[PDB]
């Protein structure tokens, strides 16, 4: 058990950590274009905002599937049941 349980804490840290790394760089690239678009067209700000939040759903989908399987490995364990 000690290895299957200790290598599940490393599994959890990579599922949430690699997702935390990619979402902070992805929203910083997406947001950098939203703030310039908001300057080039001050009257388009309400349209640019609703379109940015549509992209945000695509940007975080795989990251959020990983914060769920990581929480599922932290309070339940599909590997410990296999001895």
Residues 18-77 that bind a second copy (CB under 8 A): 18-42, 44-45, 47-49, 51-52, 55-56, 58-63, 65-67, 69-71, 73-75, 77
Residue 35 sits in the site that holds another protein (CB under 8 A):
no
CA dist., res. 22 & res. 59, Å (int): 9
Among 41, 72, 79, 80, binds another protein (CB under 8 A): 41
Q: Which two tokens stand for residue 17?
A: 């950590």
Residue 28 sits in the site that holds another protein (CB under 8 A):
no
- Taking CA atoms, 29 is separated from 13, 26, 63, 67, 72, in Å, by 24, 5, 16, 22, 30
């Amino acid at each position: 058990m000690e290895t299957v349980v200790g290598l599940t804490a490393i599994a959890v840290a990579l599922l949430i950590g690699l997702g935390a790394l990619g979402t902070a760089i992805g929203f910083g690239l997406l947001g950098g274009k939203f703030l310039e678009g908001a300057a080039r067209q001050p009257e388009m700000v309400p349209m640019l905002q609703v379109k940015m939040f549509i992209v945000a759903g695509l940007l975080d989908a795989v990251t959020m599937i990983g914060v769920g399987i990581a929480l599922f490995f932290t309070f339940a364990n599909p590997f410990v049941g296999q001895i």
